[PDB]
Design a protein around this ligand. Structure first.
Ligand SMILES: CC(C)CCC[C@@H](C)[C@H]1CC[C@H]2[C@@H]3CC=C4C[C@@H](OC(=O)CCC(=O)O)CC[C@]4(C)[C@H]3CC[C@]12C
Ligand SMILES: CCCCCCCCO[C@@H]1O[C@H](CO)[C@@H](O)[C@H](O)[C@H]1O
Ligand SMILES: CCCCCCCCO[C@@H]1O[C@H](CO)[C@@H](O)[C@H](O)[C@H]1O
Ligand SMILES: CCCCCCCCO[C@@H]1O[C@H](CO)[C@@H](O)[C@H](O)[C@H]1O
Ligand code: NA
Ligand code: NA
Ligand code: NA
Ligand code: NA
Lengths: 213, 219, 214, 219
């Protein structure tokens, strides 16, 4: 079971970063090849796809901050958390180095970096990650919520992040989605934001939902 | 119960306004940062997200004119209306001022103000608000409707309003969503429209659905 | 009950046309106010909204050609068809003239008129209307289909029609949605296409679905 | 019952290619007529619509590589594979020539051809087709998946393909949807990629889903 969940998360996060960072990097190189809104939509839709494809096998976390929040609030076994982390970072990094080849001569592989003061990007990442984790705890753990629509709801949140936070921080919510492209592009500006921001956001969204449910 | 629902409404209206106004304001300052269509899609999607997040906790009104319409048509208890109201205005205002901090130097924080003669904005806000409350009453209160799709159905209305009414009134339907950004941006052009228009919209959309949901309608 | 269904259809069709022709007319006037894709998206979304609002009351036909095809294939009673037709045209025409006042000085109120040779628009209206009626009959009348997703499915078809057929015929599928704006705009080019194409479209789509269904 | 499924696949594949290649071709002639994003959305939405129309009839394959993968992994009878392939190629080519008539004087009919080095298009077609088939096998065959949402999930994969792979290979995943337009355009650049790529993509996607769907996978 653990092996199949690990493979599921490797593949789901690989596809998440491949489509998200691929569309972002091509768009950033030339808006006539992929529009800004088009790359934001693609980032939302790949989360929709992965949730309906493996949400019932691994839970489709694709995101180390999400796995952490689920474990902290007793929705997921702590013993599996390092494995999920190993899987998500592995898939994100593989995706990014595959892109670095197949979208060449584009050499900024859909990184998330801050526009403007870094603290803007800190606060925005926290809030938009909160929104995503808040709805995630509802649709993934509350029988009173509409679980069949989990994919649409979480993808919607990712799309929002991409449209709005994309203009400030690049709209990550996801240390692995950030770190892969950063390595493939050798671009690390503000990297710590994309670790601290999302963890704060996932832990607070979860906490607030756990209070109100 | 009540306090959880207040917290729900404050968080949901905050996140509604943060995303709606922040995307609309950044877009309004520079369309290469966020496209017009992008800021409208974000507006609809945040309402989808919040309905799937808290519809089963507080009803995810996130809008005082919706709360009012629900109470008037006996779907929501009057005693909690002020609490919901305070939550929504609180969240909206808090969000607008966090935006004012973090989208700086953008200074117009996604306001809704009239394009052209103000009665165009009044008529449009009533009708697009009617649309949103009409479908809301159906999906939230009618067992024959598809309650599981409430978020998608209401968000779709919100998206239409942002696309079409965005070009005339700014597409609010939501007195708190208008007022927060107004205070944060010191822009109040036509502000009364965004109270009267949505109230008339929700009351009338609720009234019409109430008339058609029953073959023999009471009263 | 017929009264409430007629009111349902007047309201739903008014709103379909108000949003669809409103967005199209403002976009046609100035793409910086509403984008081309934006107005297409609004056209699909209002059908989503109306199907979830009144599909369980009147069936959210909103379209005389759809009402007709439902009745021909015995899914809807013939005696209500004229009332549905009256409701639909009435709502469409009223919304169009409401638009004429509130989007002034825009004066083309979101019409659907052909681009290039008229017969292109005829064929395309037939085919895109087939697609919409085909999915409609599955989701509205086949218990093996996903009835809960009917609004999403039918609205999707409407959005495709706006995006693609919008470049050829204006993408109507809907005699009332075309006639309302035509009257409000005083523009009638190719009007007959938007009666005959959609009727052929809905009848043929319903025929083929009726043939393949189990 | 086979004739009904064959008619279902002719019609579904015809409408898939009619709307996908029609929008792509008009957009490729003139972005002011249909936007690039718009034609991408049309491509995803027609798959949504066809899955909800005929998923319960024929299974809404509309794609010979999908039929192939379903049959290899014992979800579809081998004996019907040639009938579905015949249906899909007939529907697709017929749609292409109808378009050639009604979008004239546009003469490139929504073709999928490589941008840049052809090997990129091979790799990308494999990966994006893998994504499509992976979710497909979940929602069409796994009782734990949300089958009612199959249309939306598969249409979403198609949309992503059109947006991202559209800038590299044209985003096909579908030998039929490539071949029809190529014949009608007299345009065959890198055609083999749209046979090999999608076949590799659906087989490996179906393989990896088969691997992960069971704790103890038979073999
Ligand atoms: C015209 C179509 C049927 C040809 C498809 C290409 C081949 C790869 C197909 C044709 C028949 C298929 C075989 C028919 C049935 C069997 C028996 C079955 O047991 C395992 C799969 C297998 C080998 C199939 C493997 C793949 C085959 C060779
Ligand atoms: C109808 C869709 O929303 C419903 O709202 C209910 C309110 O309590 C919940 O209990 C259900 O689980 C949820 O599906
Ligand atoms: C919330 C109320 C608005 C806070 C002001 O906002 C701040 O203004 C400063 C300029 O004085 C800038 O240097 C900061 O980047 C900006 O966040
Ligand atoms: C991952 C590497 C895959 C190897 C295949 C590379 C794709 C080459 O591409 C092919 O190159 C041929 C030249 O031999 C040309 O004749 C074809 O037109 C072209 O499509
Ligand atoms: Na539930
Ligand atoms: Na219901
Ligand atoms: Na059903
Ligand atoms: Na299921």
């Amino acid at each position: 079971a653990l092996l199949k969940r690990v493979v599921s998360e490797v593949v789901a996060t690989f596809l998440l970063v491949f489509m998200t960072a691929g569309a972002a990097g091509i768009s950033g190189s030339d808006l006539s090849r992929i529009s800004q809104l088009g790359q934001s939509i693609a980032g939302g839709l790949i989360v929709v796809v992965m949730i309906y494809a493996v949400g019932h096998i691994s839970g489709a976390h694709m995101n180390p901050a999400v796995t952490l929040a689920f474990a902290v609030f007793r929705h997921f076994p702590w013993i599996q958390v390092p494995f999920y982390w190993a899987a998500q970072f592995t898939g994100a990094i593989a995706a990014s180095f595959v892109l670095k080849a197949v979208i060449h001569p584009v050499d900024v592989i859909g990184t998330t970096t801050p526009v403007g003061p870094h603290w803007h990007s800190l606060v925005v990442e926290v809030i938009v990650t909160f929104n995503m984790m808040f709805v995630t705890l509802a649709v993934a753990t509350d029988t009173r919520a509409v679980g069949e629509l989990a994919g649409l709801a979480v993808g919607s949140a990712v799309c929002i992040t991409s449209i709005f936070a994309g203009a400030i921080s690049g709209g990550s919510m996801n240390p692995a989605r950030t770190l892969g492209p950063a390595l493939a592009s050798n671009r690390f500006d503000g990297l710590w934001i994309y670790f601290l921001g999302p963890v704060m956001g996932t832990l607070s969204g979860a906490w607030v939902y756990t209070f109100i449910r």
